[PDB]
Amino acid sequence: LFYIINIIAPCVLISSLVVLVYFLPAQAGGQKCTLSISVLLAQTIFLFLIAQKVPETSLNVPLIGKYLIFVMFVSMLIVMNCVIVLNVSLRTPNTHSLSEKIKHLFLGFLAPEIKSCVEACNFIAKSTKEQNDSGSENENWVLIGKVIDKACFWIALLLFSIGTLAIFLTGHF
Amino acid sequence: LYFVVNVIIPCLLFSFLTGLVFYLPTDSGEKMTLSISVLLSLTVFLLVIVELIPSTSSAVPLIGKYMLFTMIFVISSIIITVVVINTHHRSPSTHTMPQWVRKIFIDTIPNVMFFSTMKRPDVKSAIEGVKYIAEHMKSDEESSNAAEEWKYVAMVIDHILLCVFMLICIIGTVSVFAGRLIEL
Amino acid sequence: LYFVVNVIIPCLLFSFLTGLVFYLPTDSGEKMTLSISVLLSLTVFLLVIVELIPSTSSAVPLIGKYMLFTMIFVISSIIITVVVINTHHRSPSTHTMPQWVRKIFIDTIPNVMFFSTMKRPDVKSAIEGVKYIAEHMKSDEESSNAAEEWKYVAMVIDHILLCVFMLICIIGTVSVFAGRLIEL
Amino acid sequence: LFYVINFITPCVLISFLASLAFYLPAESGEKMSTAISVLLAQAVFLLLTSQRLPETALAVPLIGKYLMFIMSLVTGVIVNCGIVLNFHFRTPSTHVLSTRVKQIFLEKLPRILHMSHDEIKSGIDSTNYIVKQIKEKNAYDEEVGNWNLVGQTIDRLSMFIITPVMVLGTIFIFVMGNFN
Amino acid sequence: LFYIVYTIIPCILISILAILVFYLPPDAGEKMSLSISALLAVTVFLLLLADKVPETSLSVPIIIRYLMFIMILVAFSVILSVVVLNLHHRSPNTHTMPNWIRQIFIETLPPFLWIQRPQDLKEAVEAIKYIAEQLESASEFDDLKKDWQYVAMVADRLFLYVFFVICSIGTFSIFLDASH
């Protein structure tokens, strides 16, 4: 009961915060990396906290230390995946290439004054057209990012729940 | 007196701040700034409390109880703030606003928020070009209107949540401590 | 075994995170956020070393030398990140690209980066106004091209530095640690 | 050797990182971020050093004097970074660009530092309105570009003025200290 | 002397930070960074003081009283920054600007505070007119928004000055009282 109330429960609460990053938007201003790296900093604090409670013999790693390492690593993976989503959503036809594979997977299953005036109107319309094309590509890449958000949300929920329950019901038995 | 001043008051202050985050408009992109810095301050204060209170295990102290409620309080706040941000930046291409969301949060709820102040030859080619620019502007304005509707919904959620979270902070605060206060 | 899990694993995480900033695009305003936060994490870790390892002054421990290496490593990565963001925002009006810079970083080196996939009455007033609009679009596109050339140079710099930094991370780590580890 | 390795070199490096703030452009909105994290690490070093010495008050140790001085210098750099962003973002509607500032920062220093049928009538009226708005925005923008250029030139001049100052201050103090 | 250095100097520099946050322009998007990072400093100073004051629970030493006063001042500076940012980011779509705010903060206070600032041709004409209209609509929306943000600006200046006075006077008084 002492370990549950003072170490286990506070640690679990903080660590469960990493699953929130899947409901942040995957574009500039979403601050997936801000959040995730801050959660990782709290996890470091937990590692320091645990160093103060386990026994001083150095022949094995305690079970609780194993578990902390595992959850820290899973959190790190999810920060990596947030960063990858940001990279994917801000892509452009110029820097990268949107393979049709990705598109199927995500967008599928889941007087001289008159002549100069007319020339300038035509040029104005053409420039607007060009700008709109470029933009259209950009919004395609934003929509892919939003699909990836949904999919990764479900993966992360499942993984965290399962992992935690099993590891902390082994100790209770 | 020693424990009040040295322990309880800082915790009150941090509770207040975390509660304040809900008055910050989403258009100022600093909701995640504020909420994650509050969370880190709370984690540190967990550290503090374990440093300070005794390490007995017979029974949960009053400060233990209060610390747990405070931790849940902060966590809830943070999660709903993320929720609002996510709602506001909701893509119309992949999502469609449910009718009941629009009816409840845009039409009726803002009206019952009385104390608030929130709103309740080549000439033919030239001519064709001009027409194309105008119609493109039309379409951009339509897209922008849908985006602005989403932002409006976020704003009216913030107002309502500001009310609601002041109420929750009060209720919980009174319940946690009144029993023991009267006991003394 | 006790020292590995208690010391080296956390240090491995931090080292790995360090270089991750260089794959993050500059478009997301968070390259300095991420790298500086990694640096701070390492500086905080120096507490852990100091609180764990023995406090003799006769000589420098193996993990002392390794942590000094890691300090310098991190600080180099962050300096180059700053450099590239500075270069990306350079303005044509003040800064004109030197010829050698263009010859090397825009023409030569991008070719020899095989692994990367980076590319290498009123009628008169109306007519004059139309002409004005069209020339203003001309000008906007020109200033954007210059600025785009600066952005392109920054992006190529980032790619190259990613590759170099991952190699240097690896090399330095192996050399520093294997040699002692085999003795154990 | 113990103090040089454990105490002096980490602190010195960390402080040196404060000079990078000046080479980081104002447009990249991360001057404050960078400077405030530097300040936090310096706080931490101060906490570290307080624990290493006795509580006597006969005199401040030499290494303590040097830490005080160098912290204070660094804090001056941070404050100046903030001031520079304040200057860069001033506009005609809120500030006055005096002649002295123009002369200094747009002519002299850039050179010294070697810096590099009524319906149709209403439609004609609407196109003329578009052009009028574009012209207004251009004058507005070129004054805002003046301000931009001022900031850039301040960056360059600040680097060239601050890095040598930090270096000379440090060299002199430390050669004095090597002769002890 | 000992106490002056070891406690008062670091405190001072953190108080200067928290004051400086009110000179940062709201457009920078850095007020919350500065202010909350100042709050982190203050809580760090409380940790710093823990291991120097006597462990008895009859009363509170004067140095802890001064730290708590300084902590509360810094908090209030944060708060007011967050208010100013709320004001700056208001728009007609969210808020209706009241008459009293406009009268007090825009008309009256600034002078006192010293601030003082053919079918086809018809078709094409309709398209041009629409373009112009869009332009103008955006301008009007921005103008209301800028009135909000101007109100924010003038409140921020006023807080700057007030906090500077308040911090200087209180710090001085406390310190002389302690060193007598």
Residue numbers in the entry:
A (entry chain E): 220 to 329, 410 to 472
B (entry chain D), C (entry chain A): 212 to 331, 370 to 433
D (entry chain B): 226 to 341, 416 to 479
E (entry chain C): 218 to 334, 398 to 460
Task: Provide excerpts from the study.
pmcThe postsynaptic membrane at the synaptic junctions of electrocytes and striated muscle cells comprises a cholesterol-rich phospholipid bilayer, most densely populated by a single membrane-spanning protein, the nicotinic acetylcholine receptor.
The present study is based on a 4.7 Å density map of the junctional receptor obtained from two helical families of tube. The junctional form of this protein, analyzed by cryo-EM of postsynaptic-membrane-derived tubular vesicles, has a tapered pore (Top) framed by a splayed arrangement of TM helices (Middle) and a symmetrical rim of MX helices lying flat against the inner (cytoplasmic) bilayer surface (Bottom). In addition, time-resolved experiments on the tubular vesicles have shown that loop C of the αγ subunit closes around the binding site, and that the pore widens, on brief exposure to acetylcholine, indicating that the (unreacted) junctional receptor is in a closed (resting) and activatable state. In the junctional protein (gold), the upper portion of the pore is tapered (Top) due to the fact that the M2 helices separate from one another in the outer leaflet of the bilayer. The densities corresponding to the junctional form show all five helices to be about equally resolved and equal in length. Only the junctional MX helices align closely with a cylindrical arc of curvature equivalent to that of the bilayer surface and so have a near-planar arrangement. The fact that these helices both lie parallel to and penetrate the headgroup region of the bilayer (Top) implies that they engage directly with the cholesterol-ordered lipids: a possibility that does not exist in the nanodisc environment. Likewise, but to lesser extents, the other subunit–subunit interfaces are widened at this level in the structure.
